[PDB]
Design a protein around this ligand. Structure first.
Ligand SMILES: Nc1nc2c(ncn2[C@@H]2O[C@H](COP(=O)(O)OP(=O)(O)O)[C@@H](OP(=O)(O)OP(=O)(O)O)[C@H]2O)c(=O)[nH]1
Ligand SMILES: [Sr+2]
Ligand SMILES: [Sr+2]
Ligand SMILES: [Sr+2]
Ligand SMILES: [Zn+2]
Ligand SMILES: [Zn+2]
Lengths: 481, 1342
């Protein structure tokens, strides 16, 4: 086989790092996550979102799980108690208004304001979020970044390309000011051939800046402050993810050692390693360097968890649940015991006693535990034949029976023709003959001019004439079926 | 225009687009789920689904809310299942969206790589990128890497830092898809045509032409190279890969289902890994197996080998469904189960007619089951279908009466395994007989290879009026009394019928009642059955014979004839329109077969059928009356059996004395002793035919003894009923000689016959030939059956197109004469054939014999009196008839009595006519007419012994008669002894020239002693035994088997005088040294004096495999050398013992040279005017060499004659017209010389070029005349070049054909016969030929 050989040669180049070498990578992981957490704390909308989504679940009475478990999780500087949940989100709301009056006065972050913003970040770092709720907070900065650089690209499109302008003059004007319109109209005041020809598209350049300058009022930070955090956030995300790769790459040899034992079960050899590598992903994300224990012991449990879960979920054609798999494994262990202790073979009456389960349960599982047989199983060969060749189709109706159904409808049509006019219409509605819908006794009465009780009389009258041997000799032949 | 009509005419195959796959699909398979363990139902979005593929039940939903056939085409809002029939699960397909592009295995691994040839990159470079080992350059500019450059990770890192941005290179199957994305098909073809201008090449030119042929076919169809790598994977319908509960309870699933799961599993994992942290090592490895997952799904037997989850077997992949000896493509013909069919053991039916068979009562009731119900409700006996079902099952008396009414006038086909020729399936009108066995007519049993001992026959029943008519008009036994292989009738009496007529016609010396006058043939029956006269004895009878009139019929000649009593009774059986002389003689199998053959052409088809049955009825009756019995006393041993044996028994011991003494050597004893027993075996056999052949002696009338013996064994041998003369030899006389496991014949033969008790040693000796002969028979059917299969696949797609083809050209036909004996006359050869040119031979006064007319059996009689020779008749080879045979320019139908009607498939009959009877599989010139021998170019020299050996390369023999004219022409080769010189009178029956047939002797010129210079024993020469002169002789070995010691030594004989000096060759002052080539056998010893004319050294040169070898056009081990260009030809330079032939004419240019091996003996010396196609090396001729030089006529007659020679020795009669049909299928496909429209080499049909040349020279804007040379392809070399992918993938390799059809974008218009059998359409032959012409005509207009 080809795919098995070169995989061992790809990870063979990467050497194993042990002891203090593991900590060097582990330190970059936690510092990488913390740098991202600092970027979320600096963002003003994240403080608003944490107060907005808190009132979404708290207003719907006191709960315990689902959404509240994703939030809270506090650390002072499991079922979460309502006493502390109301307590921790209380000072955050108080810090939202006190660190706002200093921003409106003078500059954005002026001396005293800078002291309170750093105080505001300390309150935000107190909370820890579950990945489910943590992802959208990052998306509140990822999608909004695709609104700042995209609109600036539109400004650059209708000035540098449309008006044919050098890129040197754009550096000083679109960095020092950014906010005001002292770069758009100020360039025309110098009087230049490529500066005066900007009036042709003036209704699109600084007008589109209202989808950029409005962000300063939407979020609470200037263009200088928005780009400073978003670009810094991408650093921490690249810090952790790339360091987690090095931890996985070095411990790929540990995955193979565990995967070789579970080969005779069902799944292919390479499928066990690839699923085991996904188990190694969980063994790094939840791992800490503050644990003070061996990485190999913690990784083995997570790698084995991924293999054991997939080995029962997949492998077989018909899927067998986790609880049902455990009973099949229990059957095989006692079958080895009872065969040689007694003498011959364990009977369903005797096998049910040691399992502490009723006879109707064991005899049911034995049928489910059997793997479906292959289609091309050779039986005797000689003239070359398979199992799938001798299997008959029961879905198809016989051509003799198909002709009988056609003959029955043709016979009944001549039978209904012999009836006295209205007698045929009733039976064709009561039994749905030659009609799409089947009608009830109440439905005919209102659509046949006659009363309700009379319908029962003429129905039996029509039947009696067809119960006669002289008239219905052809219909009596269909009674054989 | 029609949109919803499913009536198709053509099928096309191309590469599928990812968007086109979604068009087939109805939903996406995202889960590897199948069926729940609790309730056996499809799950969500797995392999088995109701929302995607269709509901499991007929017109029902999964939950069971929507019920009854009321709802149709209703999409559910609770489940999402369309309320339709469950047959939708057989037609609807799904799709799997791949996260990463995975390559197709059919376009990658299948040689010589479709992706590889399109990109000009070897497979080793593609796989290393795809497999994730190295990068590849896609875009190029000023990066020094240009294109398709393989780069490692360490090389790619340094290359990006130096350049980057503008440079583009990717890794994996994504790179290959991007490489096929960037390539421009319009500009790649222009560049390749420019470079093929100055540097052309010869052998390396083929790969350059291969690329153009691949690129040009890719653009014209519009396949797009981007779809080579799969992005969307289609899924099979759940019904084709089903999970059905068996009788026991355990499920049964397809191997495809197990393969599909291991595709989606890693597809779902890759979708997870791409968003949940992506390290390159793991991601590339997940893409590595996903590519292998599709590879194992499509064709498992390529890259690795996947093992089933529970079973230890290779899984049936998507490719394995089509191929594998028994799949889906191959089961359309062979593995086809058929309704309305029966099977039972065959039995005799003497009371039945030729058109009647004895079909069982209980079988016919079961077979015509629906036919009973149809004519039971119609009669008014049964009320409905169910009431008619109860009457049949109860076996009512009235049902048997109706059953006979339906069977009457309804034909029934009878098939026997195996069918070698078409007569294996014949229609018969059944007669109801009680029993479980089927009765067959004894006469038609000769057509099949059937014997009533334990054989079984298939009983097929036609259903429609069209099927009933083509069984009576075509497949009926009465219509098929003649064989399609030859003009001789196949329905010929055998065994009991022959023995009955033989005893009836034979005469005795003096039986009861002799010398009577007898009034009519009626009084002959009056005497025999009453008990007054026997069947034998010569008695005069009054007979009234009716001869054929010129107009017909008035001739009634009555005369007294001298016959027997039994011959007169048989005349009543003989029809009126037949002479009395045909029944006058004692009738055997050879004589009775002539009766039906004469009765056919003289009267018709109807009279001879009634007569054929009348012979059978009378044949059995008089065979029973005779009472022939094989007794132990009938096994008569020759009077002096052991007397002859004793004369030869110790005669072996006489040579045993010579074995020890030294008169006759040990090697010469074995072949001399065996000749005594061979002569003794024939002597006992000839003595046996005296006490068994004519042993009567006791005659009451007179004192004579001359009479044909009335022995029961001789009666079976002389008539030819059962048992030939060879069988009687072993039983009464002597068994003969037996063979050894090696192949040699045993010293002492079995003396004991089957009359006496054989010995224990003798019986163990005889067993070897029994277990070897039958062992050959066990594989004879397999070898000849493959030969029948071989000839069909090449000629099946050939039918009669036109009524007459406008060419007055054919093949010269001469009666085959071997040495001085005629095998087959002109009458049997030119019978059926239609003449191309009128008869111009003078003999009797007449006004010409008309051409383009059918030669009748009576018309050929006129040519016999005039003695006509060499007639050019219109044949199958010389035909310019688009695609098929031209009817009139072909010949007669052998099964019919006239010309073959248009529409009938010739190639299928031609293949079966040779494959069926395939199971049964000169040296000295003698003159009879008086004259005188005159010789030209004589260079004869008289030797010491007294042999007139000629020292000339070319010698011809001529005879001068009384008047002074040439009579016969014969060729004399080198190394031959002439009896008479120039101008000598010869007697009637005398040999004039004699030479050894299987050798090439070397003759010396100078006389004297022989020196063995450079002839060291062991180093160059070895000792063995020559098998012609013979004794112990020196054998010269070629430069391959020689030892390492003697490397540079030339084997040559030096001629010296009495002193020791060399005798000079008359002409040059060079010493006499005759250089001997390899393989040559030296007879002379050292010191032996030789005269002028003495031989120095001689140079040496099956059955069914021979026929197979000639049809496959395989070149022999020693091919014959032939001159290519006519003119003044001279030799050039020398090496050791070989000559380089330089052929130069007179006109311009003409640069040609040849190289010839050293051991070959030539037929030219120096400065010879040689013509095109002359024999230089004697022996077998190469099939390709004859076509190259002699033309497309001498090669066609070469195939006919060489194949027939094999069948003539075995005793098989096959016409020459059947062979030439396959010859036309060998000559097709020709190489072009002159520039026309496309390339030079290529592969275009002969007629395809003939349509081209007729269109180019007049119109079509081309004006160029494309010159073509005919090529020969032996069956399998021609059957591959079919213009259909449906026909090809039937017998050829399936994966290669389907890939070639997809890339080129081929269309199958369904014209071949094999093409329409697979799809389930009417055959473009016979009845369906007139149907097929209605659709082909409306393609141009519309
Ligand atoms: N024993 C015997 N009989 C033969 C043979 N050939 C023809 N017949 C009989 O001749 C009758 C008519 O045959 P056709 O072939 O129709 O002759 P036709 O065209 O000249 O009328 C049939 O009688 P039928 O079946 O009763 O048909 P019909 O007379 O009811 O039409 C058939 O039995 C033969 O070789 N042997
Ligand atoms: Sr009314
Ligand atoms: Sr036979
Ligand atoms: Sr047999
Ligand atoms: Zn439903
Ligand atoms: Zn022709």
């Amino acid at each position: 086989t080809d795919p098995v050989r070169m995989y061992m040669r790809e990870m063979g180049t990467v050497e194993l790092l042990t002891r203090e070498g593991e900590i060097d990578i582990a330190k970059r992981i936690e510092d990488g996550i913390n740098q991202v957490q600092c970027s979320v704390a600096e963002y003003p909308e994240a403080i608003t979102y944490l107060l907005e989504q808190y009132d979404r679940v708290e207003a719907e009475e006191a709960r315990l799980s689902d959404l509240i478990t994703g939030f809270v999780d506090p650390n002072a500087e499991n079922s979460i108690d309502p006493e502390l949940a109301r307590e921790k989100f209380a000072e955050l709301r108080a810090q939202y208004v006190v660190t706002r009056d200093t921003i409106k006065a003078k500059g954005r972050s002026h001396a005293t304001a800078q002291e309170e913003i750093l105080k505001l970040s300390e309150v935000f770092k107190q909370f820890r979020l579950v990945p489910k709720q943590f992802d959208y907070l990052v998306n509140s900065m990822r999608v909004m970044m695709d609104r700042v650089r995209t609109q600036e690209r539109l400004i650059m499109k209708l000035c540098v390309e449309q008006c044919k302008m050098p890129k040197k003059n754009f550096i000083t004007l679109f960095t020092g000011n950014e906010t005001s319109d002292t770069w758009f109209n100020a360039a025309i005041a110098m009087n230049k051939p490529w500066s005066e020809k900007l009036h042709d598209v003036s209704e699109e350049v600084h007008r589109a800046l209202q989808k950029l300058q409005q962000i300063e009022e939407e979020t609470g930070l200037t263009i200088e402050q928005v780009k400073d955090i978003n670009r810094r956030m991408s650093i921490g995300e690249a810090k952790a993810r790339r360091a987690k790769k090095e931890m996985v790459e070095a411990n790929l040899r540990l995955v193979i050692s565990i995967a070789k034992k579970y080969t005779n079960r069902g799944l292919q050899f390479l499928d066990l390693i690839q699923e085991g590598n996904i188990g190694l992903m969980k063994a790094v994300d939840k791992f800490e360097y503050r644990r003070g224990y061996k990485f190999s012991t913690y990784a083995t449990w997570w790698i084995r968890q991924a293999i054991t879960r997939s080995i029962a979920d997949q492998a077989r054609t018909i899927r067998i649940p986790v609880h049902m798999i455990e009973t099949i494994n229990k059957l095989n262990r006692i079958s080895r015991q009872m065969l040689q202790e007694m003498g011959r073979e364990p009977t369903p009456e005797e096998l049910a006693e040691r399992m502490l389960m009723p006879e109707d349960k064991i005899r049911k599982v034995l049928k489910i535990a059997k793997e479906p047989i292959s289609m091309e199983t050779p039986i005797g060969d000689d003239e070359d034949s398979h199992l799938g060749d001798f299997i008959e189709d029961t879905t198809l109706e016989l051509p003799l029976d198909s002709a009988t159904t056609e003959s029955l409808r043709a016979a009944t049509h001549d039978v209904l023709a012999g009836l006295t006019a209205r007698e045929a219409k009733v039976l064709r509605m009561r039994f749905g003959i030659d009609m799409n819908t089947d009608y009830t006794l109440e439905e005919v009465g209102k659509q046949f001019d006659v009363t309700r009780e009379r319908i029962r009389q003429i129905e039996a009258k029509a039947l009696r004439k067809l119960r006669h041997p002289s008239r219905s000799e052809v219909l009596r032949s269909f009674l054989d079926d | 225009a029609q949109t919803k009509t499913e009536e198709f005419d053509a099928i096309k195959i191309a590469l599928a687009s990812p968007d086109m796959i979604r068009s087939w699909s109805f939903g996406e398979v995202k889960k590897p789920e199948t069926i729940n363990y609790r309730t056996f139902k499809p799950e969500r979005d797995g392999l088995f689904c109701a929302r995607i593929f269709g509901p499991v039940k007929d017109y029902e939903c999964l939950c069971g809310k929507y019920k009854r056939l009321k709802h149709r085409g209703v999409i559910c809002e609770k489940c999402g299942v369309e309320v339709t029939q469950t047959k939708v699960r057989r037609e609807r397909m799904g799709h799997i969206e791949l996260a990463s592009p995975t390559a197709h295995i059919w376009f990658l691994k299948s040689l010589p790589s479709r992706i590889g040839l399109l990109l000009d990159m070897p497979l080793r470079d593609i796989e290393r990128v795809l497999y994730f080992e190295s990068y590849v350059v896609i875009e190029g500019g000023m990066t020094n890497l240009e294109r398709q450059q393989i780069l490692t990770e360490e090389q790619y890192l340094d290359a990006l830092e130096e350049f980057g941005d503008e440079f583009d290179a990717k890794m994996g199957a994504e790179a290959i898809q991007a490489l096929l994305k960037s390539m421009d098909l319009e500009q790649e073809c222009e560049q390749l045509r420019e470079e093929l201008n100055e540097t052309n090449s010869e052998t390396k030119r083929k790969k350059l032409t291969k690329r153009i042929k691949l690129l040009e076919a890719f653009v014209q169809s519009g396949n797009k190279p981007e779809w080579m790598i799969l992005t969307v994977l289609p899924v099979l319908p759940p019904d084709l890969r089903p999970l059905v509960p068996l009788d026991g309870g355990r499920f049964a699933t397809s191997d495809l289902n197990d393969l599909y799961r291991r595709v989606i599993n890693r597809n779902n994992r890759l979708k997870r890994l791409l968003d949940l942290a992506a390290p390159d090592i793991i991601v590339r490895n997940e893409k590595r197996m996903l590519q292998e997952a599709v590879d194992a799904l499509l064709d498992n037997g390529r890259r690795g080998r996947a093992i089933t989850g529970s079973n230890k077997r290779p899984l049936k992949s998507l490719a394995d469904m089509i191929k594998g000896k028994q799949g889906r493509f191959r089961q359309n013909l062979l593995g086809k189960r058929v309704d309305y069919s029966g099977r039972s053991v065959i039995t005799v039916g003497p009371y039945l007619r030729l058109h009647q068979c004895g079909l069982p009562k209980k079988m016919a009731l079961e077979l015509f089951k629906p036919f009973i119900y149809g004519k039971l409700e119609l009669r008014g006996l049964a009320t409905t279908i169910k009431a008619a079902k109860k009457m049949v099952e109860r076996e009512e008396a009235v049902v048997w009466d109706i059953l006979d009414e339906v069977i009457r006038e309804h034909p029934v086909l009878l098939n026997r395994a195996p069918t070698l020729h078409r007569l294996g399936i014949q229609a018969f009108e059944p007669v109801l007989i009680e029993g479980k066995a089927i009765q067959l007519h004894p006469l038609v049993c000769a057509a099949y290879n059937a014997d009533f001992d334990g054989d079984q026959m298939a009983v097929h029943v036609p259903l429609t009026l069209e099927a009933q008519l083509e069984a009576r008009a075509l497949m009926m036994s009465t219509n098929n009394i003649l064989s399609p292989a030859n003009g001789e009738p196949i329905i010929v009496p055998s065994q009991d019928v022959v023995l009955g007529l033989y005893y009836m016609t034979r005469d005795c010396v003096n039986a009861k009642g002799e010398g009577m006058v007898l009034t009519g043939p009626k009084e002959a029956e009056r005497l025999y059955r009453s008990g007054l006269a026997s069947l034998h004895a010569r008695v005069k009878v009054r007979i009234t014979e009716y001869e054929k009139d010129a107009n017909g019929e008035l001739v009634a000649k009555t005369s007294l004839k001298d016959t027997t009593v039994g011959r007169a009774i048989l005349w009543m059986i003989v029809p009126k329109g037949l002479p009395y002389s045909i029944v006058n003689q004692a009738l055997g199998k050879k004589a009775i077969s002539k009766m039906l053959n004469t009765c056919y052409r003289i009267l018709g088809l109807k009279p001879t059928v009634i007569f054929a049955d009348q012979i059978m009825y009378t044949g059995f009756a008089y065979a029973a009356r005779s009472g022939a019995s094989v007794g132990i006393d009938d096994m008569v041993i020759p009077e002096k059996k052991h007397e002859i044996i004793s004369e030869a028994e110790a005669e072996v011991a006489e040579i045993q004395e010579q074995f020890q003494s030294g008169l006759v050597t040990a090697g010469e004893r074995y072949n001399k002793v065996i000749d005594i027993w061979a002569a003794a075996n024939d002597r006992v056999s000839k003595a046996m035919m005296d006490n068994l052949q004519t042993e009567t002696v006791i005659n009451r009338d007179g004192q004579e003894e001359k009479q044909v013996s009335f022995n029961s064994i001789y009666m079976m041998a002389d008539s030819g009923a059962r048992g030939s003369a060879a069988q009687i030899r072993q039983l009464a006389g002597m068994r003969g000689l037996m063979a050894k496991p090696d192949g040699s014949i045993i010293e002492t033969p079995i003396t004991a016959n089957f009359r006496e008790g054989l010995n224990v040693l003798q019986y163990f000796i005889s067993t070897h030939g029994a277990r070897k002969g039958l062992a050959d028979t066990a594989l004879k059917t397999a070898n000849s059956g493959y030969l029948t299969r071989r000839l069909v696949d090449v000629a099946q797609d050939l039918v009669v197109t036109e009524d007459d083809c406008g060419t007055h050209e054919g093949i010269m036909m001469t009666p085959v004469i071997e040495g001085g004996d005629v095998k087959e006359p002109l009458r049997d050869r030119v019978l059926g054939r239609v003449t191309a040119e009128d008869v111009l031979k003078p003999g009797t006064a007449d006004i010409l014999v008309p051409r383009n007319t059918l030669l009748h059996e009576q018309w050929c009689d006129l040519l016999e009196e005039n003695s006509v020779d060499a007639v050019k008749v219109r044949s199958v080879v010389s035909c310019d008839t688009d695609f098929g045979v031209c009817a009139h320019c072909y010949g007669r139908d052998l099964a019919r009595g006239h010309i073959i009607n248009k529409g009938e498939a010739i190639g299928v009959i031609a293949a079966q006519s040779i494959g069926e009877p395939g199971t049964q599989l000169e040296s000295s010139i003698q003159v009879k007419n008086k004259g005188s021998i005159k010789l030209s170019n004589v260079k004869s020299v008289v030797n010491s012994s007294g042999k007139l050996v000629i020292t000339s390369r070319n010698t011809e023999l001529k005879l001068i008669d009384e008047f002074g004219r040439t009579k016969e022409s014969y060729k004399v080769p080198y190394g031959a002894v002439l009896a008479k010189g120039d101008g000598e009178q010869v007697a009637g029956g005398e040999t004039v020239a004699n030479w050894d047939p299987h050798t090439m002797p070397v003759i010396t010129e100078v006389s004297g002693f022989v020196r063995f210079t450079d002839m060291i024993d062991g180093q160059t020469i070895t000792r063995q035994t020559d098998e012609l002169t013979g004794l112990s002789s020196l054998v010269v070995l070629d430069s391959a088997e020689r030892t390492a010691g003697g490397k540079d030594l030339r084997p040559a004989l030096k001629i010296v005088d009495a002193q020791g000096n060399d005798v000079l060759i008359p002409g040059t002052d060079m010493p006499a040294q005759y250089f001997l080539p390899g393989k040559a056998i030296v007879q002379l010893e050292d010191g032996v004096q030789i005269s002028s004319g003495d031989t120095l050294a001689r140079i040496p040169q099956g059955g069914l495999p021979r026929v197979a070898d000639l049809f496959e056009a395989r070149r022999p081990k020693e091919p014959a050398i032939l001159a290519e260009i006519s003119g003044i030809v001279s030799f050039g330079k020398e090496t050791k013992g070989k000559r380089r032939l330089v052929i130069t004419p007179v006109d311009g240019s003409d640069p040609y040279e040849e190289m010839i091996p050293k051991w070959r003996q030539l037929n030219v010396f120096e400065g010879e005017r040689v013509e095109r196609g002359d024999v230089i090396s004697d022996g077998p001729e190469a099939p390709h060499d004859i076509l190259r030089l002699r033309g497309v006529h001498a090669v066609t007659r070469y195939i006919v004659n060489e194949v027939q020679d094999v069948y003539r020795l075995q005793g098989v009669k096959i016409n020459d017209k059947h062979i030439e049909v396959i010859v036309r299928q060998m000559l097709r496909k020709a190489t072009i010389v002159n520039a026309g429209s496309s390339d030079f080499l290529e592969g275009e049909q002969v007629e395809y070029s003939r349509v081209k040349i007729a269109n180019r020279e007049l119109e079509a804007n081309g004006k160029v005349g494309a010159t073509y040379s005919r090529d020969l392809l032996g069956i399998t070399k021609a059957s591959l070049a079919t213009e259909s992918f449906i026909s090809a993938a039937s017998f050829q390799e399936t994966t290669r054909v389907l890939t070639e059809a997809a890339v080129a974008g081929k269309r199958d218009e369904l014209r071949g016969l094999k093409e329409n059998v697979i799809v389930g359409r009417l055959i473009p032959a016979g009845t369906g030929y007139a149907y097929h012409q209605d659709r082909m005509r409306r393609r141009a207009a519309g």
